Write a protein that binds this ligand. Structure first.
Ligand code: MG
Ligand code: MG
Ligand code: MG
Ligand code: MG
Lengths: 201, 201, 200, 200
C-alpha cells in the first residue's frame, strides 16, 4: 500500500472536497496542511522546490511518489477508482455536469466579499438561481433518500454538499425555499462517515 | 443515428473545443449558432424556453433528444466515446489535469482586457508562466510528433491548441521562447482534419 | 505650454470620457493612439521608457510638460479647470458621487463577456438595477435634463459615455428609464458632441 | 446639524479610510456597524428601507441630514473640507492621482484569495510592482515623509490604510521599499492615529 499524502493550506478551499471523499470512503491519508503554525507561504515556496508540480499549485495528492495535481481531476480520479461516479455512461456524464455547475457557483462565492459590495447580489440573485437549478435537478429523479444521479451516492452529492456547507460558513443558512436541496444536504451531512469528519473538523 | 446539434452563440468561446473535436474526429453535426443574423439574446432567451437546460447556459450538445450541457463535461464525454482520453488510468488522469490547467489560464485570458489595464500583466507574466508549465510537460515525454500524454493524440492536445489559437486572435504570436509548445501547436494545427476546419472557419 | 497630448490605445476604454470632455469644451489636442500602426503593445513598451508614468498605465495626458495620469483624476482636474463640476460644495460632491457609481457599473460592464457566461445576469440584473439608480437621481434633480444643479457637469458625460459604451455591445433597455433616455439623447445632440460622435 | 453618523458593516473594507480621516482630524462621530448584533444583512436590508441611499451601497455618511454616499467621493469631500488634499491645483491632482492608484492595488488585494489560487502572483508580482510605484513617487517628492507637497494629505492615509490592510492578511515586504516603510510608520505613530489603531 502506497502512502497517501494531501498537500494544501490550512484551509478548506479547493481541498475540502477531496478530504470529504477520503472521509466518505474512510480511506486513510496524511492531511498535510501548510501554515498550521508557521508561515504558509514559505512552506508552500519550499514545497514547490521539493515537489515536482505541473502548475505550481496545490492541492497535490501524492500516492507513493505518483504526483497528482488539480483538485477537480483528483476528484474524478478518486471517484472512478472508488465507484462514486455513477453506473452508466449517461450517469457519469450527469455527475460530471452537475460538478461542473458546482465549481462555477462555488467560484462566484469565492469571488464575493464586502469590499466588492457584491455580497447581497450573490445572496439575493446568484445563489437562489443556482439553488433552484439543483432543486430542479433533484426533481428529475424522483425515480427514499436524496441523490442527484441514479439511485446511488456520487461525488456530485458531496460537491453540492460541500458548496453549501462552505457558503454556510460565510453566510446565513439560506435553504428554506429549496426543500429537496435542504433535505439532500442534511441527508448526506448525517451519513456516519461524513458526520464524524465534520464534527472532528 | 441520432441527430447531433450544438447550440451556442456565433462565437468560439467555450464551444470551440467541442467543434474542434467533431472536426478532428470528422463526425457530422449541425453547428447551430445564435445571432448569426438576429439578436443573439432573444434567440437564447427563447432557446432556454424551448430546451430543458440544467443551468440556463450554453454550450448545449444535443444527441437525439438527450440534452448535454457544460462544455468541459461534453468534452470529457466526447473523448471517452471516441478514444481520445488516453490509454491508461494514469494517462486519463494526466489529460484531465492538463485540461484543468487549460481552463484556468483560458479563463484568465477571457478576463483580460484594455479597460482593466491588465493586458500587459497577462502578456508579460501570466502567459509565459503558463506557456512554461506546458513546455515543461511536453518535456516529460520525451519518451516523433508532439503529445502531452502517452504516444497518442488526446483532447488535452486540442485544448492547449485551442487556448493559444484563441489568444492569438486577441494578442501577438508569443511562442518563440517555447519551442516544444510552438511545435505542438503547429503539429496539431496541420493535421488534415483540423487544418481544413480552421481554414473553413 | 499647451499644446496638449492624450496618449492611449486605439480604442475608447478609459480615455473616451476625456475625449468627450475635450469635445464638449472644444479643446484641441492630439489624440495619440497606440497601434494605429502595428503592435500597440510595442509602442506602449517604448512609451513607458520614454515618458515617465507614475503607475505605468494609460491614459496619460501631457499639458505642455506635466505628465497627468489616472483617468478619473484627469477628468476631475479637467472638470474643475473648465467649470463643469458643479456650482456648490454639495453639488460638486454629488457630481463626484455619481461618477463614482458610473465607474462601478462601468467596471462591471467590462467584466461581462461570452466566456464568463455572465452577460444575461448583467442584462437582466446589473444594468437594470443601475439604470434604476440613475433614474431616481434624475427625478431627485429635475424641477419644472441634468444630474446636478442647473448645468452640464461631467457626471452627465460620464453617464452618457457609460450607456453609449454599453450600446456598442448590447441591445440595452432605456425605455423603462424615460428620464435616463432623454438625458443621454440630450447630451448626444449637443453640437460639439454630436459632431465628435459623428466623427468617430 | 452635526452630529455625524457613519454606517457600514462591522469591518474595515471601504470605511476604514474614513475612520482614519476622522481619527487624524479628531472628528467625533458614531461609528455605526452592521451586525454588532446579529444578521448584518438584516440590518442592512432595513437600513436600505429607512435611509434613502443613491446606489444602495455603504458606507454612507450622514452629516446632520444629508446622506453622503460613495467612499472615495466621501473622502474627497472630507479632505477638501479639512485641508488635507494639497495646497495647490497641481498637488491636489497629485493626491487624487495617488488615491486612484491606491484604489487599484487595493481592489486587486480584495480580489486575491486561497480559492482563486492567485495569492502568490499578487505577493510576487502585483504588490512589489505597486510598492515600486509608491517608492518612486516618494523619491520624486522628498527634498532635504510626504507624497504631496509639505503636509499630510489623504494620499498619505490611503496608502497607509492600504498597506495596513494587506499586513492583516499577508507577510508583505516593505524592506525593499525603505521610503515607503518609513512613510507608513510615520503615519502609524501620529498620536491621533496610533491612538485609534491601538483602540481597534
Ligand atoms: Mg481544478
Ligand atoms: Mg464548463
Ligand atoms: Mg482611473
Ligand atoms: Mg467608492
Amino acid at each position: 500500500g502506497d502512502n497517501i499524502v494531501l498537500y494544501y493550506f490550512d484551509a478548506r478551499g479547493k481541498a475540502e472536497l477531496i478530504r470529504l471523499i477520503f472521509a466518505y470512503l474512510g480511506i486513510e491519508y496524511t492531511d498535510k496542511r501548510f501554515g498550521v503554525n508557521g508561515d504558509a507561504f514559505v512552506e508552500f515556496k519550499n514545497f514547490k522546490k521539493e515537489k515536482d508540480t505541473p502548475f505550481e499549485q496545490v492541492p497535490i495528492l501524492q500516492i507513493g511518489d505518483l504526483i497528482l495535481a488539480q483538485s477537480q481531476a483528483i476528484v474524478r480520479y478518486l471517484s472512478k477508482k472508488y465507484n462514486i461516479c455513477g453506473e452508466s455512461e449517461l450517469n457519469e456524464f450527469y455527475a460530471d455536469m452537475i460538478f461542473c455547475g458546482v465549481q462555477d457557483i462555488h467560484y462566484k462565492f469565492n469571488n464575493t466579499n464586502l469590499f466588492k459590495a457584491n455580497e447581497t447580489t450573490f445572496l439575493n440573485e446568484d445563489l437562489p438561481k443556482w439553488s433552484g437549478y439543483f432543486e430542479k435537478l433533484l426533481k428529475k429523479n424522483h425515480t427514499d433518500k436524496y441523490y442527484f444521479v441514479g439511485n446511488n451516492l456520487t461525488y456530485a452529492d458531496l460537491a453540492v454538499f460541500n458548496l453549501y456547507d462552505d457558503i454556510e460558513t460565510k453566510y446565513p443558512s439560506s435553504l428554506k425555499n429549496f426543500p429537496l436541496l435542504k433535505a439532500h444536504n442534511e441527508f448526506i451531512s448525517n451519513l456516519p462517515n461524513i458526520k464524524n469528519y465534520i464534527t472532528n473538523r
